[PDB]
Tab-separated table of C-alpha atoms in Angstrom:
chain	number	residue	atom	x	y	z
A	1	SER	CA	51.476	69.366	4.646
A	2	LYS	CA	52.126	66.574	7.134
A	3	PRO	CA	50.018	65.518	10.072
A	4	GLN	CA	51.643	65.584	13.562
A	5	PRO	CA	54.600	63.192	13.485
A	6	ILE	CA	55.033	60.496	16.004
A	7	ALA	CA	58.170	59.087	17.637
A	8	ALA	CA	57.302	55.848	19.434
A	9	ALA	CA	59.495	53.834	21.821
A	10	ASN	CA	59.258	50.093	22.350
A	11	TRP	CA	60.685	48.942	25.712
A	12	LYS	CA	61.617	45.326	26.627
A	13	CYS	CA	64.932	44.975	28.523
A	14	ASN	CA	64.830	42.528	31.422
A	15	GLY	CA	67.691	43.538	33.716
A	16	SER	CA	66.669	46.784	35.618
A	17	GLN	CA	64.430	49.811	36.187
A	18	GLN	CA	67.639	51.696	36.823
A	19	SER	CA	68.290	52.287	33.146
A	20	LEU	CA	64.603	53.033	32.331
A	21	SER	CA	64.530	55.525	35.231
A	22	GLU	CA	67.588	57.323	33.914
A	23	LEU	CA	66.280	57.391	30.353
A	24	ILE	CA	62.962	58.793	31.592
A	25	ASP	CA	64.842	61.645	33.323
A	26	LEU	CA	66.832	62.215	30.214
A	27	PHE	CA	63.575	62.499	28.292
A	28	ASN	CA	62.052	64.688	31.029
A	29	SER	CA	64.978	67.151	30.699
A	30	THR	CA	65.021	67.268	26.873
A	31	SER	CA	63.704	70.289	24.965
A	32	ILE	CA	61.349	69.587	22.072
A	33	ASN	CA	60.148	72.482	19.894
A	34	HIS	CA	58.336	71.200	16.819
A	35	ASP	CA	54.890	69.606	16.998
A	36	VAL	CA	55.489	65.899	17.753
A	37	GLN	CA	53.724	63.230	19.778
A	38	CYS	CA	56.215	60.995	21.565
A	39	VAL	CA	55.060	57.569	22.838
A	40	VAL	CA	56.729	55.170	25.278
A	41	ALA	CA	55.417	51.569	25.505
A	42	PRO	CA	57.165	49.942	28.454
A	43	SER	CA	56.604	46.371	29.649
A	44	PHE	CA	53.251	45.813	31.292
A	45	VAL	CA	55.042	45.409	34.621
A	46	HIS	CA	56.780	48.815	34.187
A	47	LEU	CA	53.595	50.666	33.272
A	48	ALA	CA	52.998	52.092	36.854
A	49	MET	CA	56.585	53.196	37.365
A	50	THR	CA	56.709	54.848	33.909
A	51	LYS	CA	53.413	56.711	34.317
A	52	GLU	CA	54.372	58.417	37.582
A	53	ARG	CA	57.990	59.149	36.594
A	54	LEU	CA	57.517	60.291	32.972
A	55	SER	CA	56.377	63.945	33.060
A	56	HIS	CA	57.290	65.431	29.640
A	57	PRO	CA	54.217	67.117	28.131
A	58	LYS	CA	54.890	65.720	24.629
A	59	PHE	CA	55.172	62.049	25.792
A	60	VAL	CA	52.231	59.674	26.466
A	61	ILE	CA	52.260	56.035	27.638
A	62	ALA	CA	51.172	53.058	25.507
A	63	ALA	CA	50.426	49.455	26.402
A	64	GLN	CA	51.237	46.526	24.085
A	65	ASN	CA	49.276	43.612	22.684
A	66	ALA	CA	46.392	43.469	25.241
A	67	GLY	CA	44.871	40.207	24.016
A	68	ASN	CA	41.549	40.603	25.852
A	69	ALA	CA	38.434	42.738	26.491
A	70	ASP	CA	39.079	42.796	30.218
A	71	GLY	CA	42.778	43.652	29.468
A	72	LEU	CA	41.582	46.762	27.318
A	73	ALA	CA	39.146	47.933	29.988
A	74	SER	CA	41.600	47.801	32.890
A	75	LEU	CA	44.306	49.616	30.895
A	76	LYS	CA	41.827	52.399	29.953
A	77	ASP	CA	40.614	52.681	33.568
A	78	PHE	CA	44.221	53.009	34.688
A	79	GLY	CA	44.838	56.137	32.463
A	80	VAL	CA	46.371	54.425	29.447
A	81	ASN	CA	45.103	55.751	26.058
A	82	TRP	CA	47.596	54.217	23.577
A	83	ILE	CA	48.242	50.638	22.499
A	84	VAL	CA	50.673	49.126	20.022
A	85	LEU	CA	49.807	45.901	18.125
A	86	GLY	CA	52.877	43.985	16.828
A	87	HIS	CA	51.048	42.215	13.983
A	88	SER	CA	53.961	41.872	11.561
A	89	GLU	CA	55.847	39.842	14.081
A	90	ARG	CA	52.923	37.896	15.382
A	91	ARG	CA	51.810	36.970	11.842
A	92	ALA	CA	55.309	35.648	11.011
A	93	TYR	CA	56.033	33.878	14.312
A	94	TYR	CA	52.611	32.502	15.380
A	95	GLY	CA	50.318	32.732	12.330
A	96	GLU	CA	48.085	35.530	13.634
A	97	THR	CA	45.579	36.242	10.837
A	98	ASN	CA	44.943	39.668	9.357
A	99	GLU	CA	41.286	39.319	10.336
A	100	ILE	CA	42.237	38.809	14.020
A	101	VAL	CA	44.460	41.917	14.155
A	102	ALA	CA	41.731	43.870	12.323
A	103	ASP	CA	39.297	42.781	15.015
A	104	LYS	CA	41.752	43.831	17.767
A	105	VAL	CA	42.217	47.291	16.136
A	106	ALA	CA	38.417	47.764	16.013
A	107	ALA	CA	38.087	46.511	19.589
A	108	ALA	CA	40.820	48.876	20.829
A	109	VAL	CA	39.335	51.883	19.064
A	110	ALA	CA	35.860	51.176	20.425
A	111	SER	CA	37.449	50.880	23.915
A	112	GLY	CA	38.800	54.449	23.726
A	113	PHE	CA	42.328	53.846	22.494
A	114	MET	CA	44.685	55.412	19.913
A	115	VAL	CA	46.058	52.365	18.140
A	116	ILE	CA	49.392	51.894	16.431
A	117	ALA	CA	48.968	48.905	14.107
A	118	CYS	CA	52.246	47.270	12.980
A	119	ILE	CA	51.944	45.751	9.577
A	120	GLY	CA	54.689	44.352	7.443
A	121	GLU	CA	55.952	41.469	5.325
A	122	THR	CA	58.555	38.754	5.932
A	123	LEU	CA	62.066	38.635	4.465
A	124	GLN	CA	60.978	35.848	2.075
A	125	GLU	CA	57.999	37.935	0.911
A	126	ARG	CA	60.143	41.009	0.378
A	127	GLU	CA	62.576	38.653	-1.385
A	128	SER	CA	59.943	37.458	-3.927
A	129	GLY	CA	58.640	41.017	-4.421
A	130	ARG	CA	55.390	40.912	-2.371
A	131	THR	CA	55.771	43.947	-0.140
A	132	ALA	CA	52.960	45.611	-2.121
A	133	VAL	CA	50.547	42.738	-1.811
A	134	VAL	CA	51.238	41.640	1.725
A	135	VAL	CA	51.125	45.235	3.038
A	136	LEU	CA	47.898	46.330	1.249
A	137	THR	CA	46.152	43.056	2.221
A	138	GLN	CA	46.798	43.733	5.925
A	139	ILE	CA	45.608	47.309	5.500
A	140	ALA	CA	42.505	46.018	3.600
A	141	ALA	CA	41.611	43.660	6.436
A	142	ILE	CA	41.878	46.519	8.952
A	143	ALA	CA	39.658	48.814	6.786
A	144	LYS	CA	37.014	46.113	6.674
A	145	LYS	CA	36.581	46.444	10.417
A	146	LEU	CA	36.911	50.223	10.759
A	147	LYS	CA	34.362	53.036	10.241
A	148	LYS	CA	35.641	56.281	8.570
A	149	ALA	CA	35.838	58.146	11.898
A	150	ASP	CA	37.814	55.266	13.442
A	151	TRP	CA	40.825	56.337	11.328
A	152	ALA	CA	41.233	59.474	13.455
A	153	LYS	CA	42.154	57.014	16.304
A	154	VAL	CA	44.444	54.881	14.111
A	155	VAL	CA	48.153	55.063	13.230
A	156	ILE	CA	49.859	52.696	10.847
A	157	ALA	CA	53.454	51.595	11.447
A	158	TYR	CA	55.110	49.944	8.470
A	159	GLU	CA	57.433	47.599	10.321
A	160	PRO	CA	58.784	44.968	7.954
A	161	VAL	CA	59.849	41.856	9.833
A	162	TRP	CA	63.322	41.711	8.192
A	163	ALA	CA	64.073	45.185	9.691
A	164	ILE	CA	63.206	44.197	13.297
A	165	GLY	CA	66.403	43.988	15.460
A	166	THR	CA	68.556	42.752	12.559
A	167	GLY	CA	70.479	45.969	11.725
A	168	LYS	CA	68.778	46.133	8.315
A	169	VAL	CA	66.850	49.344	7.593
A	170	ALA	CA	64.700	50.340	4.628
A	171	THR	CA	66.206	53.152	2.511
A	172	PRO	CA	64.562	56.595	2.427
A	173	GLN	CA	63.145	55.592	-0.998
A	174	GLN	CA	62.292	51.974	-0.126
A	175	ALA	CA	60.098	53.171	2.741
A	176	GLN	CA	58.581	56.204	0.991
A	177	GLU	CA	57.323	53.834	-1.673
A	178	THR	CA	55.335	51.430	0.563
A	179	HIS	CA	54.173	54.449	2.556
A	180	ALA	CA	52.951	56.321	-0.579
A	181	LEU	CA	51.273	53.095	-1.584
A	182	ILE	CA	49.377	52.846	1.749
A	183	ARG	CA	48.259	56.452	1.684
A	184	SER	CA	46.973	56.204	-1.961
A	185	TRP	CA	45.005	53.017	-1.219
A	186	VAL	CA	43.474	54.628	1.855
A	187	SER	CA	42.730	57.734	-0.276
A	188	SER	CA	40.852	55.801	-2.934
A	189	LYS	CA	39.156	53.346	-0.543
A	190	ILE	CA	38.276	55.669	2.347
A	191	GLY	CA	38.846	59.291	1.279
A	192	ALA	CA	41.503	61.934	0.615
A	193	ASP	CA	40.763	63.726	3.905
A	194	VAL	CA	41.499	60.507	5.900
A	195	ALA	CA	44.526	59.548	3.754
A	196	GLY	CA	46.225	62.940	4.238
A	197	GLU	CA	45.532	63.054	7.963
A	198	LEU	CA	46.845	59.520	8.481
A	199	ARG	CA	50.189	59.041	10.226
A	200	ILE	CA	52.162	56.244	8.621
A	201	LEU	CA	55.241	55.578	10.789
A	202	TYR	CA	58.245	53.498	9.661
A	203	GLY	CA	59.706	50.908	12.076
A	204	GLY	CA	62.626	48.448	11.980
A	205	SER	CA	66.303	49.161	12.833
A	206	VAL	CA	65.742	52.902	12.985
A	207	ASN	CA	68.475	54.866	14.716
A	208	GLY	CA	69.688	58.415	15.384
A	209	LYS	CA	71.733	58.301	12.151
A	210	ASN	CA	68.973	57.427	9.656
A	211	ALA	CA	65.917	59.140	11.308
A	212	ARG	CA	66.657	62.527	9.713
A	213	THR	CA	66.650	61.263	6.118
A	214	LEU	CA	63.647	58.886	6.331
A	215	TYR	CA	61.524	61.644	7.797
A	216	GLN	CA	62.335	64.002	4.836
A	217	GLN	CA	60.260	61.589	2.718
A	218	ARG	CA	56.813	62.998	1.920
A	219	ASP	CA	54.773	60.080	3.273
A	220	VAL	CA	56.828	59.210	6.406
A	221	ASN	CA	55.197	60.557	9.564
A	222	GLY	CA	57.538	59.287	12.233
A	223	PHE	CA	59.062	56.098	13.679
A	224	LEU	CA	58.555	53.038	15.734
A	225	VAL	CA	61.831	52.363	17.538
A	226	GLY	CA	62.897	49.328	19.562
A	227	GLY	CA	66.600	48.829	20.374
A	228	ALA	CA	67.511	52.474	19.698
A	229	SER	CA	64.751	53.797	22.046
A	230	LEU	CA	66.612	52.335	25.022
A	231	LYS	CA	69.464	54.778	24.321
A	232	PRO	CA	69.960	58.577	24.636
A	233	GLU	CA	70.012	58.805	20.838
A	234	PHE	CA	66.190	58.473	20.812
A	235	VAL	CA	66.383	62.203	21.517
A	236	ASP	CA	67.989	62.542	18.083
A	237	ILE	CA	65.249	60.395	16.443
A	238	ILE	CA	62.634	62.750	17.940
A	239	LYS	CA	64.515	65.839	16.681
A	240	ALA	CA	64.666	64.213	13.232
A	241	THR	CA	60.818	64.508	12.886
A	242	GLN	CA	60.994	68.052	11.608
B	1	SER	CA	65.260	8.247	38.800
B	2	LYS	CA	64.886	11.212	36.422
B	3	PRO	CA	62.124	10.936	33.755
B	4	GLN	CA	62.912	11.327	30.045
B	5	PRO	CA	64.747	14.668	29.443
B	6	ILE	CA	63.711	17.229	26.889
B	7	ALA	CA	65.843	19.500	24.772
B	8	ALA	CA	63.572	22.189	23.262
B	9	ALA	CA	64.648	24.646	20.505
B	10	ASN	CA	62.863	27.924	19.819
B	11	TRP	CA	63.601	29.535	16.393
B	12	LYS	CA	63.160	33.280	15.454
B	13	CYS	CA	65.688	34.892	13.017
B	14	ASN	CA	63.830	36.149	9.834
B	15	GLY	CA	66.413	35.850	7.016
B	16	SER	CA	66.651	32.166	7.743
B	17	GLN	CA	65.642	29.583	5.110
B	18	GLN	CA	69.288	28.753	4.277
B	19	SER	CA	70.522	29.137	7.880
B	20	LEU	CA	67.673	27.017	9.305
B	21	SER	CA	67.979	24.531	6.462
B	22	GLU	CA	71.691	24.111	7.358
B	23	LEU	CA	70.862	23.506	11.055
B	24	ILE	CA	68.253	20.896	10.169
B	25	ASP	CA	70.741	19.038	7.955
B	26	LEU	CA	73.077	19.353	10.896
B	27	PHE	CA	70.566	17.857	13.349
B	28	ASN	CA	69.416	15.127	10.965
B	29	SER	CA	72.987	13.879	10.665
B	30	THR	CA	73.646	13.994	14.455
B	31	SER	CA	73.873	10.707	16.339
B	32	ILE	CA	72.094	10.753	19.682
B	33	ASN	CA	73.042	8.072	22.173
B	34	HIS	CA	70.601	8.292	25.120
B	35	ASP	CA	66.822	8.594	25.459
B	36	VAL	CA	65.910	12.323	25.035
B	37	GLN	CA	62.953	13.996	23.314
B	38	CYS	CA	64.176	16.872	21.193
B	39	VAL	CA	61.705	19.554	20.210
B	40	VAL	CA	61.904	22.233	17.530
B	41	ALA	CA	59.599	25.238	17.563
B	42	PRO	CA	60.235	27.177	14.358
B	43	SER	CA	58.265	30.359	13.638
B	44	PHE	CA	54.852	29.621	12.110
B	45	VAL	CA	56.222	30.986	8.825
B	46	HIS	CA	58.797	28.122	8.607
B	47	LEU	CA	56.501	25.397	9.837
B	48	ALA	CA	56.043	23.512	6.546
B	49	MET	CA	59.727	23.888	5.606
B	50	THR	CA	60.932	22.403	8.933
B	51	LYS	CA	58.352	19.640	8.770
B	52	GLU	CA	59.615	18.701	5.313
B	53	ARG	CA	63.359	18.687	6.095
B	54	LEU	CA	63.655	17.451	9.696
B	55	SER	CA	63.712	13.699	9.942
B	56	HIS	CA	65.776	12.699	13.004
B	57	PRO	CA	63.698	10.087	14.979
B	58	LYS	CA	64.434	11.893	18.281
B	59	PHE	CA	62.939	15.228	17.087
B	60	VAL	CA	59.393	16.540	17.058
B	61	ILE	CA	57.919	19.831	15.858
B	62	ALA	CA	56.149	22.281	18.167
B	63	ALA	CA	54.094	25.441	17.553
B	64	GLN	CA	54.722	28.543	19.662
B	65	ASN	CA	51.821	30.497	21.186
B	66	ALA	CA	48.880	28.844	19.424
B	67	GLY	CA	45.996	30.903	20.638
B	68	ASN	CA	42.822	29.832	18.944
B	69	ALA	CA	40.532	26.812	18.707
B	70	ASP	CA	40.626	27.145	14.930
B	71	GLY	CA	44.426	27.466	14.932
B	72	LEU	CA	44.909	24.098	17.175
B	73	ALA	CA	42.718	22.235	14.631
B	74	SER	CA	44.957	23.436	11.823
B	75	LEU	CA	48.026	22.422	13.760
B	76	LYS	CA	46.527	19.056	14.604
B	77	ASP	CA	45.716	18.330	10.910
B	78	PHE	CA	49.134	19.537	9.775
B	79	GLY	CA	50.571	16.848	12.088
B	80	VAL	CA	51.973	19.199	14.828
B	81	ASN	CA	51.433	17.718	18.269
B	82	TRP	CA	53.485	19.973	20.590
B	83	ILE	CA	52.909	23.624	21.576
B	84	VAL	CA	55.012	25.998	23.694
B	85	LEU	CA	53.176	28.749	25.665
B	86	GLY	CA	55.538	31.665	26.408
B	87	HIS	CA	53.593	32.783	29.508
B	88	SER	CA	56.406	34.208	31.583
B	89	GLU	CA	57.218	36.631	28.769
B	90	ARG	CA	53.585	37.557	28.004
B	91	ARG	CA	52.830	38.086	31.656
B	92	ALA	CA	55.769	40.479	32.021
B	93	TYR	CA	55.360	42.248	28.651
B	94	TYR	CA	51.591	42.243	28.114
B	95	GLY	CA	49.945	41.517	31.432
B	96	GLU	CA	48.735	38.086	30.434
B	97	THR	CA	47.021	36.593	33.484
B	98	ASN	CA	47.752	33.214	35.024
B	99	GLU	CA	44.141	32.265	34.470
B	100	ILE	CA	44.413	32.757	30.727
B	101	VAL	CA	47.508	30.566	30.426
B	102	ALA	CA	45.768	27.918	32.502
B	103	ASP	CA	42.816	27.947	30.098
B	104	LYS	CA	45.171	27.558	27.143
B	105	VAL	CA	47.055	24.656	28.660
B	106	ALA	CA	43.697	22.867	29.383
B	107	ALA	CA	42.520	23.635	25.810
B	108	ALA	CA	45.674	22.325	24.218
B	109	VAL	CA	45.650	19.114	26.350
B	110	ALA	CA	41.928	18.510	25.579
B	111	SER	CA	42.846	18.670	21.969
B	112	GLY	CA	45.585	15.983	22.263
B	113	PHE	CA	48.635	18.245	22.355
B	114	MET	CA	51.740	17.928	24.533
B	115	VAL	CA	52.212	21.308	26.177
B	116	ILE	CA	55.309	23.057	27.383
B	117	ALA	CA	54.081	25.754	29.732
B	118	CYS	CA	56.672	28.486	30.408
B	119	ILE	CA	56.388	30.059	33.903
B	120	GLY	CA	58.712	32.523	35.607
B	121	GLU	CA	59.175	35.819	37.501
B	122	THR	CA	60.478	39.228	36.421
B	123	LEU	CA	63.770	40.800	37.378
B	124	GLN	CA	61.962	43.046	39.893
B	125	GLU	CA	60.228	40.061	41.489
B	126	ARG	CA	63.515	38.186	41.704
B	127	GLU	CA	65.328	41.187	43.271
B	128	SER	CA	62.553	41.631	45.838
B	129	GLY	CA	62.309	37.969	46.962
B	130	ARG	CA	59.047	37.230	45.204
B	131	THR	CA	60.255	34.331	42.920
B	132	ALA	CA	58.633	31.556	45.021
B	133	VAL	CA	55.232	33.210	45.482
B	134	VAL	CA	55.213	34.288	41.833
B	135	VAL	CA	56.181	30.897	40.375
B	136	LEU	CA	53.955	28.875	42.700
B	137	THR	CA	51.007	31.089	41.937
B	138	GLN	CA	51.525	30.307	38.188
B	139	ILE	CA	51.730	26.586	38.641
B	140	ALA	CA	48.652	26.489	41.015
B	141	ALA	CA	46.583	28.434	38.451
B	142	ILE	CA	47.551	25.947	35.705
B	143	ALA	CA	46.832	22.993	38.064
B	144	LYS	CA	43.345	24.206	38.841
B	145	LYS	CA	42.385	23.575	35.192
B	146	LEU	CA	43.982	20.091	34.940
B	147	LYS	CA	42.843	16.621	35.959
B	148	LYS	CA	45.428	14.201	37.301
B	149	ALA	CA	45.603	12.247	33.990
B	150	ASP	CA	46.299	15.500	32.049
B	151	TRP	CA	49.770	15.936	33.678
B	152	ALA	CA	51.041	13.228	31.315
B	153	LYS	CA	50.511	15.821	28.539
B	154	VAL	CA	52.215	18.621	30.529
B	155	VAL	CA	55.834	19.827	30.637
B	156	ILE	CA	56.816	22.803	32.808
B	157	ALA	CA	59.584	25.190	31.791
B	158	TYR	CA	60.988	27.439	34.473
B	159	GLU	CA	61.919	30.479	32.342
B	160	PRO	CA	62.818	33.541	34.424
B	161	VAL	CA	62.257	36.656	32.335
B	162	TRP	CA	65.568	38.264	33.413
B	163	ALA	CA	67.433	35.365	31.834
B	164	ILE	CA	65.743	35.389	28.397
B	165	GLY	CA	68.096	36.693	25.737
B	166	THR	CA	69.969	38.753	28.301
B	167	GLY	CA	72.957	36.461	28.784
B	168	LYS	CA	72.204	36.286	32.525
B	169	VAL	CA	71.744	32.546	33.039
B	170	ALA	CA	70.430	31.220	36.334
B	171	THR	CA	73.044	29.508	38.485
B	172	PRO	CA	72.795	25.704	38.982
B	173	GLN	CA	71.523	26.297	42.514
B	174	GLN	CA	69.105	29.033	41.461
B	175	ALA	CA	67.380	26.733	38.941
B	176	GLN	CA	67.409	23.734	41.401
B	177	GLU	CA	65.882	25.841	44.145
B	178	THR	CA	62.918	26.877	42.006
B	179	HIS	CA	62.497	23.484	40.310
B	180	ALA	CA	62.393	21.908	43.806
B	181	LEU	CA	59.658	24.332	44.959
B	182	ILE	CA	57.631	23.519	41.828
B	183	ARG	CA	58.002	19.739	42.275
B	184	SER	CA	57.311	19.958	46.048
B	185	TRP	CA	54.156	21.903	45.329
B	186	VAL	CA	52.947	19.340	42.736
B	187	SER	CA	53.761	16.314	44.935
B	188	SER	CA	51.899	17.806	47.877
B	189	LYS	CA	48.867	19.158	45.957
B	190	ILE	CA	48.607	16.526	43.201
B	191	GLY	CA	50.626	13.399	44.049
B	192	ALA	CA	54.126	12.022	44.393
B	193	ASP	CA	53.473	9.854	41.320
B	194	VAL	CA	52.615	12.897	39.158
B	195	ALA	CA	55.544	14.950	40.610
B	196	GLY	CA	58.241	12.280	39.928
B	197	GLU	CA	57.052	11.891	36.310
B	198	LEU	CA	56.880	15.642	35.538
B	199	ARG	CA	59.508	17.205	33.300
B	200	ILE	CA	60.631	20.532	34.672
B	201	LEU	CA	62.907	22.221	32.067
B	202	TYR	CA	65.014	25.336	32.629
B	203	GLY	CA	65.144	28.158	30.101
B	204	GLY	CA	67.014	31.459	29.978
B	205	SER	CA	70.479	31.989	28.420
B	206	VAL	CA	71.234	28.274	28.198
B	207	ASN	CA	74.211	27.481	25.948
B	208	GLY	CA	76.803	24.763	25.206
B	209	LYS	CA	79.058	25.604	28.153
B	210	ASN	CA	76.527	25.969	30.996
B	211	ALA	CA	74.103	23.096	30.044
B	212	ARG	CA	76.168	20.224	31.465
B	213	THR	CA	76.320	21.553	35.014
B	214	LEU	CA	72.655	22.589	34.968
B	215	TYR	CA	71.397	19.126	34.059
B	216	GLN	CA	73.421	17.652	36.971
B	217	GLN	CA	70.847	19.186	39.356
B	218	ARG	CA	68.373	16.640	40.697
B	219	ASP	CA	65.195	18.434	39.630
B	220	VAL	CA	66.284	19.717	36.221
B	221	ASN	CA	64.822	17.635	33.327
B	222	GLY	CA	66.040	19.487	30.296
B	223	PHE	CA	66.152	22.851	28.566
B	224	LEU	CA	64.292	25.414	26.524
B	225	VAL	CA	66.850	27.096	24.285
B	226	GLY	CA	66.424	30.338	22.354
B	227	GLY	CA	69.526	31.933	20.791
B	228	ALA	CA	71.825	28.945	21.290
B	229	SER	CA	69.389	26.648	19.432
B	230	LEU	CA	70.117	28.564	16.223
B	231	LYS	CA	73.797	27.625	16.594
B	232	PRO	CA	75.688	24.290	16.169
B	233	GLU	CA	76.154	24.090	19.974
B	234	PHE	CA	72.535	23.047	20.383
B	235	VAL	CA	74.179	19.620	19.813
B	236	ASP	CA	76.182	20.195	22.955
B	237	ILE	CA	73.047	21.149	24.902
B	238	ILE	CA	71.393	17.900	23.857
B	239	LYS	CA	74.426	15.819	24.852
B	240	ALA	CA	74.408	17.553	28.281
B	241	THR	CA	71.063	15.864	29.212
B	242	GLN	CA	72.666	12.869	30.797
């Protein structure tokens, strides 16, 4: 039995609102049957436009990387209930510590948010066989700052850095493994009820072609999609969560 | 008479040790005629590697988005003396306020760093005529937190968001128009001495072919290069700063 899957979109383009607007209408006209929570995280400056225009009942809006208490509070007052934290990338590029993202997860949860925490290893780490370590260490740090009930507001996205906008995607087995690994750790550290209920999304070069197969994996509960979420094929990715 | 130009390189590719290593060898062996300060901002994860292989006397290492008192101290002990603050992108994508980037610039400068502060408007702001008000508001906010002597540690990069990784470079006159506003503002509010010494760099889809004509503009002092800094043409960009 799987928990509700999630199909999350990461928006970034910097040359219109024309395309976003048309995608939003495409999403607003799409028919979705199965139980799935879709999420669209546009740029901060497109948040207002997106909120008003996006009307599909199975889509919600998420903010990204609100590095501040006042940032969290104003987003929540504005009607935003989701936030995505791009830790894998920020750890690799700027040296953001696991403790700092753990603190931000705890802060976001306490502020009323549903938090999608992006954890993952570098190419060099995956190279030397450290996916296991690196990934569980980030999850361990997060657990240290979360109460058991906090996990109902948390979603884990396994987004390995080497998969992010490179065209390289983890295989349905190579993702199931690190996912199964996360769930078992959570099970034995926090509880079986929390571990089973926990959505563990896969992110990194996902597209309409691979979505179907990755989702068939027992411990994959949806996707975090960047480049492919700016295209009509996202509709396919959603459909693939059944 | 233009102050010393800067050619700044921002690295972010993942599967890169060999590729980066090749570039460094390439840079190390390059002969650079004129007076130019070259800067390389690798991802945190390749800091030590770059610091061990780069040796050209006209090159320094920079950290990107160092956001922590504890993290500057680390950087400072590791021998890194330059930092680049990607504010234009964080403002657009995450809502980062002008006040927060001003606090960071002041923090970095108080700690002995040279700071490249990246300011710029969004596509929407550019299409609606708001570039001037938006850019000038960003520089004024940063100024408020600086003493006159601190400007020696400051470098401004005009980095319009709609030009970052989109291929849409600003025209020579577009960049000169905004650089001129910036410099006019500083000369009037701070001093003509400070304004004439200030390096105002342009960033956004800079490459080997468009660099030359950009640097010919009176108030352009150099470049911030993303995707073209990973390629051999970065050499061309450097040569164009004369």
